[PDB]
Amino acid sequence: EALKAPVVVLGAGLASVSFVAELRQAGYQGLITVVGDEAERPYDRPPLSKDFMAHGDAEKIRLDCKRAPEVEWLLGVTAQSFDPQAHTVALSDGRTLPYGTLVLATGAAPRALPTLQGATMPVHTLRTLEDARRIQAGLRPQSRLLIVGGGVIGLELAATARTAGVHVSLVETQPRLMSRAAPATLADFVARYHAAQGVDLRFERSVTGSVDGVVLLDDGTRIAADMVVVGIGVLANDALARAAGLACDDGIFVDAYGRTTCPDVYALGDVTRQRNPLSGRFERIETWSNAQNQGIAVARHLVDPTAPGYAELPWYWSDQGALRIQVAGLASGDEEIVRGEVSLDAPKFTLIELQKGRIVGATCVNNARDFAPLRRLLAVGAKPDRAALADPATDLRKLAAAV
Ligand SMILES: Cc1cc2nc3c(=O)[nH]c(=O)nc-3n(C[C@H](O)[C@H](O)[C@H](O)COP(=O)(O)OP(=O)(O)OC[C@H]3O[C@@H](n4cnc5c(N)ncnc54)[C@H](O)[C@@H]3O)c2cc1C
């Protein structure tokens, strides 16, 4: 009933690929056309601040579109508008696509830093393969890089650059790193780690401008750099939705079925503002797992309306040099349990966040084995013995089973 052919998807990132693969796997055999503005074989973004940045082979980062047969991918073309009454999309190449169902999977773009508008030195953001190539082409040993923003992508780049012999400074307006989505205990540890690897961290500082290759700060000081990479967050690519009259606020509002306020128009991935089931609040979730899992859930329910809505709880990972970080659920509750020592010597530890005895979040550093059982405990809102949670004798995989 809701799934009317033909299907058109705007954007050819992970959310789009995941969605169209699930349509096909679920048994939808009608037309699917995907419009992607980048002239690139669909690819995954996490490598761009990690192994790609370090090794440079794009053929290792392409998405597998095998599970999406009989899809026409229009690469290198921009959707300029859609008409939700006429059920058409206008493309940059002069063509128009009809749709029965339109899916907005247009992701998000890095925020620009207003104070570096009109800079006369290299200032880049890191979102695309083209961006990664441009940054890498300036990543010369003994170069000086300034990163603005202490989010995970900036820190991943910082680690990659330090490994490459680049001098790295980093300016963060907040008193801590990773202020968006990380427990304070983790953020404090991560700052200690980056400082130990030679990153020059500047907290509670903002950029006020730049002159002749030097960046100015609001403490009245200067940082010289060969290159600036801005990583102060992203803004949803929701321009077509806004123009067409959908409800948007730095992100397209969707329910758990991916429905927008416009009939026959859905949205998924980084472009969406959606319910976080742990907080009960709407948020723009900016994670790989959301893009994949939301795409799959929305596709499944389109093909099979008896399927449940999207219900997965949020999580991400970050690879920052020697730290393999995994974070699930909420950054804080009324209680944190620490498993292991938090030490720069062979870092390995787990954090558990509880709210009235209930697990609401978890972090693992170099401890992948414990993250899977903790996510299962989180998912059912488990209330385990806090003594056992702390006790390292406890096997978390066993708790997961017991529940
Ligand atoms: C460098 C980097 C590292 C990351 N590392 C991690 C990590 O370690 N862990 C993690 O959990 N997440 C990570 N992420 C986040 C994750 O990659 C994103 O959540 C994911 O890419 C979102 O996918 P999406 O399909 O919703 O959006 P996107 O990947 O942004 O895809 C949307 C596509 O639509 C295109 N588009 C926009 N407007 C139009 C239009 N009008 N017409 C046609 N096409 C259009 C965009 O240009 C883009 O190609 C990282 C992201 C980056 C950039």
Q: Which strand ranges, in their side-by-side order, compose the sheet holding 335-339?
A: 315-320, 323-329, 358-365, 349-355, 335-339
Instruction: Report how far Cα 352 is from the mean position of its chain's Cα atoms.
Output: 22
Superfamily of domain 3-107+236-314: FAD/NAD(P)-binding domain (3.50.50.60)
Taking the C-alpha atoms of residue 236 and residue 254, their distance in angstroms, rounded to an integer, is 13
Hey, how many other C-beta atoms are within 10 angstroms of the C-beta on 26?
16
Taking the C-alpha atoms of residue 43 and residue 61, their distance in angstroms, rounded to an integer, is 6
Beta-bridge mates of residue 207: 217
Q: What topology does CATH give the domain 111-233?
A: FAD/NAD(P)-binding domain (3.50.50)
Query: How far away, in angstroms, is 12 Cα from ligand 1 center?
Result: 9
| Same topology between domain 111-233 and domain 315-403 | no
Taking the C-alpha atoms of residue 244 and residue 262, their distance in angstroms, rounded to an integer, is 9
Answer whether CATH 3.40.50.10490 is correct for domain 315-403.
no
- Which two structure tokens, joined as six digits, stand for 70? 């009989």
Helices and strands, counts by H and E, the chain? 10, 26
Query: How far away, in angstroms, is 105 Cα from ligand 1 center?
Result: 9
Q: How far is CA 318 from CA 205, 322, 325, in A?
A: 24, 11, 5
Crossing angle of helices 14-26 and 288-303, in 10° steps, is 30
Question: What are the residue boundaries of the structural domains of the chain, listed by start?
Answer: 3-107+236-314, 111-233, 315-403
Taking the C-alpha atoms of residue 392 and residue 388, their distance in angstroms, rounded to an integer, is 8
Crossing angle of helices 184-196 and 152-163, in 10° steps, is 20
Hey, how many other C-beta atoms are within 10 angstroms of the C-beta on 398?
11
- Experimental determination technique: X-ray
∠ CA(321), CA(201), CA(148), 5° rounding? 90
Q: Which residues line ligand 1 (CB under 6 A)?
A: 10-16, 35-38, 45-46, 48-49, 78-79, 105-108, 126-127, 153, 237, 240, 269-270, 286-289, 291, 316-318
317 is in an annotated binding site: yes
Query: How far away, in angstroms, is 232 Cα from ligand 1 center?
Result: 16
Residue 121 C-beta-side C-alpha neighbours within 13 Å: 22
Q: Is the dihedral of CA 388, 392, 393, 395 positive or negative?
A: positive
Taking the C-alpha atoms of residue 193 and residue 159, their distance in angstroms, rounded to an integer, is 10
* H or E element at residue 26: helix 14-26
